[PDB]
Amino acid sequence: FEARQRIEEKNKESSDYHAKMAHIVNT
Amino acid sequence: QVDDEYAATSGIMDPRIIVTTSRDPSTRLSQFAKEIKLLFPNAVRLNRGNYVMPNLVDACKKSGTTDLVVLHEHRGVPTSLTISHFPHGPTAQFSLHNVVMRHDIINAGNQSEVNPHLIFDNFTTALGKRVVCILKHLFNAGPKKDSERVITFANRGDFISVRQHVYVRTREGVEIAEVGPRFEMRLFELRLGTLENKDADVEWQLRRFIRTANKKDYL
Amino acid sequence: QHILKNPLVAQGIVDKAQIRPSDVVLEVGPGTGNLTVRILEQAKNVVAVEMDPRMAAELTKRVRGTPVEKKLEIMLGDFMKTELPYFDICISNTPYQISSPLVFKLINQPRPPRVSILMFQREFALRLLARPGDSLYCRLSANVQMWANVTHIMKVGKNNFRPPPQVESSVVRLEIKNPRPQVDYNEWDGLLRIVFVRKNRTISAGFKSTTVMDILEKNYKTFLAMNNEMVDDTKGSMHDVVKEKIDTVLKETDLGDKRAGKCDQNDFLRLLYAFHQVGIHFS
RNA sequence: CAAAGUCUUUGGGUUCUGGGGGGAGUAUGGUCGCAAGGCUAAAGACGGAAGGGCACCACCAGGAGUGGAGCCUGCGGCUUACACGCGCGCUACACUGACGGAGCCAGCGAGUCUAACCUUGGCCGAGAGGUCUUGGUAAUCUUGUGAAACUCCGUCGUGCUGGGGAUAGAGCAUUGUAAUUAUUGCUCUUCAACGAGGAAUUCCUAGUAAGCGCAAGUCAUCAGCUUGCGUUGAUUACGUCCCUGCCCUUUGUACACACCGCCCGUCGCUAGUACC
RNA sequence: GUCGACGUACUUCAUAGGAUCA
């Protein structure tokens, strides 16, 4: 249960940060 | 997907089964073999006593048989299983864990052994496809429009679990009763060579001391 | 049949609709539910209208085991022949040949919606959102701008579509006036049909055709015969009287010289009232 | 292409235009523009009948049992930094027996290079255990694994004895850093229950039940277990539907020759019509 | 107002051809 909840936290946080750096640049 | 192990024979001919055991079963293991016999249609069984397996399987092959299941145990209760599809088909070697016994609990009616209804739940990867096709080609082709014997395979968390349930289409929905055993079934190898080879093409082995197999399904 | 593949215009269409947690969405032409499931999250109860039972079967397969499984009805058949239930906003992708029926069916509902997010072909939408005096001010704009109000949202360019079609699309928020105003419908439409036949000739031009003077003479006679006031001497047939009658209006309200594709809505009102005042009706 | 030519890089006069094409996009401290609204309110289905096949979940015959003992062991109580409920196995409960010597028939594979495996012999030590060496990187050496039950005679008389060893203690090797918590192996000594096991109880139809040993632990399960390998080796059923339950039809529907020649009841769909 | 027409600024899509060998 620990290892799963870590995987969804890690995936969401990583993807969102890359999405912000996709949200800035071709502005 | 139908395979070269099944393409010429999938819906063409309905199969028969043979149930047997490794060497000198315990009595309860024989009783469980009886349960897995009476669950399957086209059910005929034969005790293995002092038999050379190449001779046994080779003699069973000219007589005509589609598949062969044979069991194992650990001091009374079974732990392992394998399926050998005869026409050069793939042997599959599983670890089975839990069981409920129709003898043990109650006489809850009858395993009517009608051509049953088939359920394969939550299989995605091509290995799930291999398991689905190999196991589907063991059931009878042609249950009726209202075959009340629903066999159930579930593939959550790499531990496929099987039950049997019997339903009646009651006023607002179906209603089911639990029969057959209930399982924690799990594979660990696929070999396209039949077990008489002992050395042929292994399709698949479960990596065990690989780290990520804590998490990952299907290797 | 085209498919809105872009997974980011879909969310924007949905959240501009301002769905409240107590709404009944009509969602016309759902497709394969690329769009629907967002509405299922945000509305109490969705009523999807569909014609392809292949799509209906797949769409109702999509919601199985999902918590939103019981908040979706499906109505089959032709959209322009059902009886829509009450619905409270409306979200629509439906293929464009019903774009002009759809709008008026929403305007003429009993208890119409409150906001609707509609997808249209670019030139169609630019008819709908064209103010008086533009190049595109048509009869459609004068109708729809009487009973509704129509506001652009975005451009959906043609490469968000599988397969890519040739025309660009628009997303448009339409919102019905409430109460609907108390001019008639059929008088408004009769007048607009006449004066918008040739959009840039002056208004007195449209009251010269002999089909039109036949129509107005017939209507004026039937109006007098509705009030049972017997008829005077006419040099041709009755349109004689009507002729000077029409001219007199187009002297007083001045409108017999302005060009109908530059006259905004109050001018059509003043013209409608002036013809009503002298005993002319359009249906 | 007779101009789109003017002997390799360029001048006969003069007017005009370009500063880079095509398809998609995104941003904006910029310029010009661009709405409507303030009173109005949905909720065909159901029960029954007969006709043919099926079952160590049926009948018949038994074989092996467990459930008795003792000991190991898989799911259930309670405790620690032990009076227990459901089950699987082995050993025996003795003259077809038990001990002394003689003879002896296998197969499966496994085994070691910069390590010591699997081995042969001779050696000594009751034994346990220590001696150097070749054979083998594999049919070669184990290995013919000279296996155990098996066969002969010997001893013994049914004796809870010599069947039986659960139970302890001591000594010996033997490791390992230590055995200490009898890790293991020999030896001596200790000699419990067990007099055939009720209610029940599972499996079983021939190389079968049953009994015996050898090999290996090859990514899952397994160590007083598992899976192979072979040995010896039987009785009764090979018949039945009486009960139990399962499957097939009710147009035999499918084409001469021999049979017969409506599936039945309840609520249905609709039609008709006497009635108000 | 995720408004339009511009004006600036930027992004992106379209690159392989012959010869020998396998």
From Swiss-Prot, chain A:
The entry's localization annotation reads: Nucleus, Nucleolus
From which domain of life does this come?
Eukaryota
Q: Which residues form a coiled coil?
A: none
Give the family this protein belongs to, as stated in its UniProt record. Belongs to the NOP14 family.
The annotated subunit structure for this chain is: Interacts with snoRNA U3. Interacts with EMG1, MPP10 and NOC4. Component of the ribosomal small subunit (SSU) processome composed of at least 40 protein subunits and snoRNA U3.
The function of this protein is: Involved in nucleolar processing of pre-18S ribosomal RNA. Has a role in the nuclear export of 40S pre-ribosomal subunit to the cytoplasm.
Put simply, this protein is called Nucleolar complex protein 14
Record organism: Saccharomyces cerevisiae (strain ATCC 204508 / S288c)
What fragment of the full-length protein is this? 761 to 787 of 810
Swiss-Prot record, chain B:
Q: State its location(s).
A: Nucleus, Nucleolus
Q: Which residues of the full protein are shown?
A: 72 to 290 of 290
Residues that span the membrane, as ranges: none
Q: How does it assemble?
A: Component of a heterotrimeric complex containing IMP3, IMP4 and MPP10. Interacts with MPP10. Component of the ribosomal small subunit (SSU) processome composed of at least 40 protein subunits and snoRNA U3.
Write the protein's name.
U3 small nucleolar ribonucleoprotein protein IMP4
Q: Name one GO molecular function term.
A: single-stranded telomeric DNA binding
Instruction: Look up what happens after changing R48A.
Output: No effect on RNA binding
Got any disulfides in this one, which pairs? none
From Swiss-Prot, chain C:
* GO cellular component labels: 90S preribosome; cytoplasm; nucleolus; preribosome, small subunit precursor
Q: What is its EC number?
A: 2.1.1.183
- Primary localization class, coarse: cytoplasm
PROSITE patterns membership: RRNA_A_DIMETH, SAM_RNA_A_N6_MT
Keyword terms, alphabetized: Cytoplasm, Methyltransferase, Nucleus, Ribosome biogenesis, RNA-binding, rRNA processing, S-adenosyl-L-methionine, Transferase
The protein's job, in short, is: Specifically dimethylates two adjacent adenosines in the loop of a conserved hairpin near the 3'-end of 18S rRNA in the 40S particle.
The protein, known as: Dimethyladenosine transferase
